[PDB]
Design a binder for this molecule. Sequence first.
Ligand SMILES: [Zn+2]
Ligand SMILES: [Zn+2]
Ligand SMILES: [Zn+2]
Lengths: 113, 265, 62, 46
Amino acid sequence: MNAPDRFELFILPDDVPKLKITPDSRVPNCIIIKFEREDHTLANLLREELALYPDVTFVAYKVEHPLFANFVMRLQTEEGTRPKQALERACASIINKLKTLDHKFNEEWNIKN
Amino acid sequence: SKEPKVNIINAQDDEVELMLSDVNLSLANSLRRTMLAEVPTLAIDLVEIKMNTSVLADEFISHRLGLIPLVSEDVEEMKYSRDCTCEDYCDECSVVLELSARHEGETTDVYSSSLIKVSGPGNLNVGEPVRRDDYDQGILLCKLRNHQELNIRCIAKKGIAKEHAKWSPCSAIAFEYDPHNKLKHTDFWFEVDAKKEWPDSKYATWEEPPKPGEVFDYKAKPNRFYMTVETTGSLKANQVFSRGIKTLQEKLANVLFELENSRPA
Amino acid sequence: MIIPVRCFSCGKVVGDKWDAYLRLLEEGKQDALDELKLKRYCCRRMVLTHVDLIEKFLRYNP
Amino acid sequence: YGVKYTCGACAHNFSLNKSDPVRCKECGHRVIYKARTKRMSKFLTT
Ligand SMILES: [Zn+2]
Ligand SMILES: [Zn+2]
Ligand SMILES: [Zn+2]
């Protein structure tokens, strides 16, 4: 009756970017990234790998409200180092970790009877 | 070989126990849910009933078939009806099925085995009534009496567990870590003795016991996770792990891709 | 009212398992669930609680 | 090809119109259902 169409939990709707990045005025060298059609599955994973770049001064994320599949990610880094980059890096470190995983799980498997 | 590492334990066709070490829980969990919800599959989605004298109603059966597990091997070389340039559907993005059931044998049953595959499979593993039943007719759709008929026509499509549960190929997944509460990520309830009143897990044997004389370790983090990946069919227990590991990756990709599309301007 | 394909709770299929069960009773006189491969109670309760009405419905004429 | 009304018991395709009585080709039992449609009905699998 009033509930959305299921496919609104992953498909971007009419003109909408996965990412929208906004500068934060509250404190220097900080940003808030709006991720559209996403959740903890991906949020918390990005949040995590950032407290890994000891070059990142801050990193938390949140789901405004459960009805809407979106989420905000706030990042702040050291001097003259752009967080967006740290987002790239910490994001890449993620794929590799998984790239390795995929592989280590395949050779491993074959050795089964 | 490199970063995180696996160490499979007893594994079969409908399960895959294994230990995942050298990874942040955060990341284990992420993969956890990804299997549970976002791996492309193939389920019946549209049902065009023609005749039906069964005691079950139209949409009741319709539901049923939505759940019947279909093949989803080369599910990846098919397209989402939403992206296919064909008005409605076609061989390039769907699998059509037939079902005819006339009551002749004066209780006749309708098993998922009774499904035809009227459209062109284009020579790719997909659209098959996954049967694991001992006899050879897995999933009793429904029963019917004397002269009750029933003619359908199903159309299957890609989709995922987000869109609907009728998709996710996961179906239950075990997850545990640090069986001996060393990290103290829990405060055991108890009347007198926590340890005696709280069942010890079968997982406590691949990690060393506590050892009293030691003070509380703090700098230690959640490393190593004992899991188990059950499958319902559609995709091989192994893949339901691989593909998972990969889709999560594809997503992490666009987050980096979408990124790039925003630097030029 | 027929058997429920796949368990609500976890998801594991369970449509086929009906006849196997209702059989391991009548004859083998038996636990049944356990061998049918129905481990954790979520799916367990699924089978062990189904009351197959369809049978009685089927007893009706046209 | 073609069917109009059916009987509550002896499900035998009938067919009528005004004043032609409201019974059946035998059984007096004056019930009768109005058999399914020709235009197929389309369903969703959720
Ligand atoms: Zn198409
Ligand atoms: Zn279950
Ligand atoms: Zn009559």
